Amino acid sequence: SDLGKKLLEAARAGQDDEVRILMANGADVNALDEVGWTPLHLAAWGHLEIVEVLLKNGADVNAADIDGYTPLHLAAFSGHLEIVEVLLKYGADVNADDQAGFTPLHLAAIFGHLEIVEVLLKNGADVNAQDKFGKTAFDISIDNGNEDLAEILQ
Amino acid sequence: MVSKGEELFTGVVPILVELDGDVNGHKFSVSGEGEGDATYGKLTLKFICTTGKLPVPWPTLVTTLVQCFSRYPDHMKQHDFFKSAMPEGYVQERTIFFKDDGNYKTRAEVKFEGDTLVNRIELKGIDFKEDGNILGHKLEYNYNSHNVYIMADKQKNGIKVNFKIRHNIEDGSVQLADHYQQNTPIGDGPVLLPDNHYLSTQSALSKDPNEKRDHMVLLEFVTAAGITLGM
């Protein structure tokens, strides 16, 4: 699978049309690198048009990396609302944890991304889920003194 | 009114590392020498235990033994905290939790002394099992690629760094080492506080065929990524 390595690199590099070419010529949409990242993990950091192309071509929306992180985790960590939205549209697990130690809601709360918090809640995020430190998203907003968020979360 | 520390890394920079260690009362000292080239994210170092046999596996010390040599792409240069603290340097604090075993606490100063980038560390390990994977030397002599997650800590004028290391056990499974890290500038000058991003790491461990002391030869490549604005 050498086209798959090329696809991982094209996704990392943000080369929208190279991703299109590689997949039309047979590249494995779910190619894996050494840290368990697929092209969709790489694109979750801000490459919206590549996210969309990958999902349309069968990318595993819920693939977990070696640390347990799904693309939705990475999009919440890096603050990309439109990517969060398209991932959820394509069936991303809004409450994925399974060794990550955080749900996407926790990550959005940690970094004060109120719009992402609201989208996650609308898609069924569990406000009572506790992260690996025992904290809910509400607790996180209290610890950060974010009363705009504490408000939204009650 | 902005730091110029990145200009100290345009070429090859010599490195010295000095580690004073104590794990469960087992004391040791490690010295490293080599060089770094941030333009390719490249580190070339050799480490020697100068006090005898190393009482823990070499792989468990790799993260403790200079992230200013990470390659930050041109479009991410405003997110490189490590170089922006130079030459005065930064303090690097960690706790490393070995799952079902003990923990390392480490405190280091990373700074220029002359033309040389120097990493000076104190390490304290407690609560290890003498028959566990660490004091029992059950870890493979190799190293995996990892993702290192970097976040601004504005209240400390620095960064928070979190990641998990997986040490292959010589049998089957993996020993988790959970890293909690904090970096703060030593000087009073301006620093760069980054947006959230990650480093992609890759490390190769080997031996020097002519070295009779306990030692580790290390070749490492690290590139920052995850900020797509301006690519």
Author numbering:
A (entry chain A): 12 to 165
B (entry chain B): 0 to 64, 68 to 233
Copied sentences from the primary study:
All hydrogen bonds except two (GFP-residue Gln204 to Asp143 and His114 of eGFP) are also found in the complex structures of the parental DARPins with eGFP. The structures of the GFP-clamps confirm the intended design: both DARPin-derived domains overlay well with the parental DARPins when superimposed on eGFP. Most interactions between the DARPins and eGFP are found in the single DARPin complexes as well as in the GFP-clamp complexes, confirming that both domains can bind their respective epitope without strain or steric hindrance.
